[PDB]
Amino acid sequence: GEWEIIDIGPFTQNLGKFAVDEENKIGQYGRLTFNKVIRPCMKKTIYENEGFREIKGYEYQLYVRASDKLFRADISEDYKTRGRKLLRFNGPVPPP
Amino acid sequence: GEWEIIDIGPFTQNLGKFAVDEENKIGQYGRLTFNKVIRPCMKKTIYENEGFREIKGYEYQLYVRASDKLFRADISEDYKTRGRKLLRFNGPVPPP
Structure with missing residues (x-):
């Protein structure tokens, strides 16, 4: 469905942590x-x-800095169970 | 560095055409x-x-269907000159 840009507050940072983990x-x-x-x-x-x-759920597309390099990660979350999955993790990529 | 999601009107489609060309x-x-x-x-x-x-200018990140495959293309446009450049093009990528 719909897309939106979201800020990089605690919630988002924690999505990055999930991706790196x-x-x-x-x-x-x-x-x-x-x-x-x-x-x-x-x-x-x-x-x-x-x-x-x-x-049904969400997908998040992130730029995540880990070990001084920048990567792209895509994360899905199921609304009901709150399960998250790492759909893609790629890099190093150039800065956005 | 500031971002917004824009619609896929004639302007945007023309950016797609430019990318393919x-x-x-x-x-x-x-x-x-x-x-x-x-x-x-x-x-x-x-x-x-x-x-x-x-x-200084703009960058557009597009998902472009060409020859029934899906690609990612990034296009820069200079504010003063209106010159456009294809910064990159790759795929096939999975649907967003």
């Missing part, structure tokens, strides 16, 4: 140290159905 | 046929000096 479990970029999530941060709201406002 | 000149992605720019479309305002008012 999970990537660290995967191990493709070594041992990473979360530094910071930077602007911009995009949120997509995913609705359960056309015609209705029930929210 | 330019990529076609470059030839690193084959011979492409522009179809459509889809949501979401992010516009960055680029200031001459960060924290200060004067606008």
Whole structure:
């Protein structure tokens, strides 16, 4: 459904932490140290159905600084169970 | 560095066409046929000096359907000259 830019407050930073933690479990970029999530941060709201406002979940697209390098991460969250998954983690990328 | 999501009106579509035209000149992605720019479309305002008012130009991050595949393209536009450049182009990427 809809997209919006969100600020980089505690909630967002904690999404970055989730992303680094999970990537660290995967191990493709070594041992990473979360530094910071930077602007911009995009949120997509995913609705359960056309015609209705029930929210199925969200996707977040982040730029996350870890171990002095900048990466892109995409994170899904289920509205109901609050489960999050790391959909993509890529970099180093150039600064936005 | 300041961001906003913009709609995919004729202006934006024309940016898509420019991206495909330019990529076609470059030839690193084959011979492409522009179809459509889809949501979401992010516009960055680029200031001459960060924290200060004067606008140097803009950057547009697009999702562009060409030849039935989806690519990511970033386009800069200079505020004073209106010159545009294709900063990058890649894909195929999964739908946002």
